[PDB]
Symmetry: D4
Amino acid sequence: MDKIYIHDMEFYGYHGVFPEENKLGQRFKVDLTVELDLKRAGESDDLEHSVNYGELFELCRKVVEDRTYKLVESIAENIATDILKQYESISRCTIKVIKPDPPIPGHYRAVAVEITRERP
Amino acid sequence: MDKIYIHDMEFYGYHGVFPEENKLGQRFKVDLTVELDLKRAGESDDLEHSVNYGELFELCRKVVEDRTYKLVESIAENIATDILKQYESISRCTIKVIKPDPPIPGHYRAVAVEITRERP
Amino acid sequence: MDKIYIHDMEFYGYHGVFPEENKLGQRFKVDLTVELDLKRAGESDDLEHSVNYGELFELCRKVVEDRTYKLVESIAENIATDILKQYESISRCTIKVIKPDPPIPGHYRAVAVEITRERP
Amino acid sequence: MDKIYIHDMEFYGYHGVFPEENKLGQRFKVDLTVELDLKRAGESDDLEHSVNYGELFELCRKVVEDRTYKLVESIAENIATDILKQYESISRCTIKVIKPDPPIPGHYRAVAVEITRERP
Amino acid sequence: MDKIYIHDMEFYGYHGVFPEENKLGQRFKVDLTVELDLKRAGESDDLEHSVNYGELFELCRKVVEDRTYKLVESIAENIATDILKQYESISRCTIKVIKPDPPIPGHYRAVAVEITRERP
Amino acid sequence: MDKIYIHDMEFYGYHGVFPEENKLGQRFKVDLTVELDLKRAGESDDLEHSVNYGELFELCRKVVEDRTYKLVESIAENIATDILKQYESISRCTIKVIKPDPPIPGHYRAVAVEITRERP
Amino acid sequence: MDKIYIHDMEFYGYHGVFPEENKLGQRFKVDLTVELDLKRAGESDDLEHSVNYGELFELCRKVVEDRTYKLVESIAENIATDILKQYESISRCTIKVIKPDPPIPGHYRAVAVEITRERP
Amino acid sequence: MDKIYIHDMEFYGYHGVFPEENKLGQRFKVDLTVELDLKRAGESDDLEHSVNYGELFELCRKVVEDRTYKLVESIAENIATDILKQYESISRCTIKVIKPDPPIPGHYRAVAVEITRERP
């Protein structure tokens, strides 16, 4: 189905299991995909037949920056949950939450969680 | 099925919902995928058994640069529509339209719309 | 299904078919994907309802750096095997092992092996 | 199924429709994916239960550099054809041939053709 | 002399000569370099003898995001001036203010201004 | 002195010694640096005391795309000359003209020429 | 003079002023440059007349990973000092210590310190 | 003075002190800069007054791929020497020879040597 993307949103949050992460904080990145039929929007050039991605950004901003969880998994679930609650037009969404600088002695690009959620 | 790609075409257009975007303009990027059986072209080395991607580029150039819409969704729909009208050989096409520098206070790589279209 | 990623882990190992590779060694990179239902972890914000990716990293570290095989294929199989043995919560995993600097006179980015493994 | 990759092989060839491309030549890039069950190779650490990707590279080198076609589509077909002829172990392969610097006045990253081929 | 760098700070600001830029805003990037004797700090491992680069970031964040000018030149002049004003130990500084997405119809990576300042 | 940059302007031109290049064309890139006192502009926030870099882009776009030379050296000389001719406040400039895709059989990122010019 | 470089060495260390950084750790990067006359080595193809850069790496790995300081300035000072101490043929060196992921709430690529050292 | 660059030439060579490197080989990269007066060439658009950079590439390809040394220092010395020997108009040159994949157990981007040469 037609999809809207928001690529590589960068936030600074305080999520983590260690209390030392809650004090220091670190970068968190989010990739967003929402599914929805967008033919009526492109047919009509009318934004009410689509979804404002500027709001989609503010949703992820609040979950990552205005809150503090232990698991990045909780970030993905609350982001996806809040997407499906407020946009009935969206049928399904895939949320990827990236932790690029975790306290994992080693060498890597990032660790990440990725979920797909739809309504029952 | 066999596919032709045109990766990361960069245009400068004036699409957007805000009138201040229509005056200033901004970058727009398009990723194109068309589906079509290309065995006969590779078997014969004859361009009429394939599709000239140089024309495929000019199609996207006109829709993004020679026109001004409100929604990038309308860019993807008109690009895909004009592909399917003029190339009967193409069975299906996926159009991705990227807005890398939208007026969204925040931090991200881009927002994008992506559709898949075929004939009825 | 919900997935955990570990992107682009870089190790230095001594795997290879040529004995001259076993003496010199070279870079090896691993991309990891594990499948598992992570709703209960995001619902509860409790790490025991998910998998510690810091351990997931140490698993790949041992297979690539604490051992020496002939084939990178054996790296992917042992990494995936050791994932499925120790985490019953993981249903399926996809392992990609990258050899970026092989003794292949030519020009390329990398050669890689990629497998998907689940329990019988 | 298990897969072997060769990422972003760079060659210099003389393929093209215009005679001016046949004289000047240009860069050509190839991404290769072959499908084959690699458990027996990783189980045994024995290269005869897998495929030498160094030969896989030389196959693409000859088709792109030792020959001159009109269409890049013919490059993908002959590469895939020669893969399936010489390696019965390979069940399916996907070939992507990239033309990064075509004579297309405009702005883009590349144009490319991508096919998937198996035995009848 | 010795140097401290703060590489590629990314902000969202509303600078610009045109009124449409002040309403819409756009990304702004800053590269910072300051010059000072760091030998005492490295020998003694004592921040008392160096400059907190977390403050240097806040100084830059202040000019770009807490203020709105017509010119990016004014960002560079006010960042620099604020530095020599507050840090006696800093002898010289080079400020580079990047406007990656200006309203210039064309194809480019960015435009920027760079200044170097010391005390008379 | 202080500096203005226009980083990685990308054009499509028909420069080249060989006649086949003039018919086919290829990408051309230009890095621009101009030197001038920017202190008045940053202090007063007044473009009257600086140089419109939107014009500096158009000057470069003029030489590369509105003209065809044999040498990229001629691009650099004509860009520079046009700058010192039109901008009294500019004391010195460095022009770098990149030919990323020349017809040189080989493996490389680009070839380029760079000149620096001031008034006698 | 002539120069040897060791570009973008990546380590994991526990440096930092805050106690939480010493417990958690983070990535540290180092760019190394040493200056020395290399003409004898290039003319004679004899390492006896140059410096083993495998040792230069181990010297850097020693300071970053075998030691823990408060300041990255101390990394640079101890790397440099260890170089001029052990390599008579090296006349001057420039050390740059990068902290890509400091606990600074904000958006940036990295912060770093850079020193240059010679003998009195 | 004015300059010509040949950026990131990639070769495959068999240089190295250890015998295992000579048997296996590895990538080698070269950055070239030559200095010369280019004003005549840019003013007259006449290659007669400049240097064919296609030859400069072949000179570099000659030393790296047609020869095998112990040291990368010898690559730089022989590339430079061959340049000042064959191009009277070139006043000075800087050669940088990159060994991206040396057999150093560790994590880094590359090691390299850089020399600058002029005539006595």
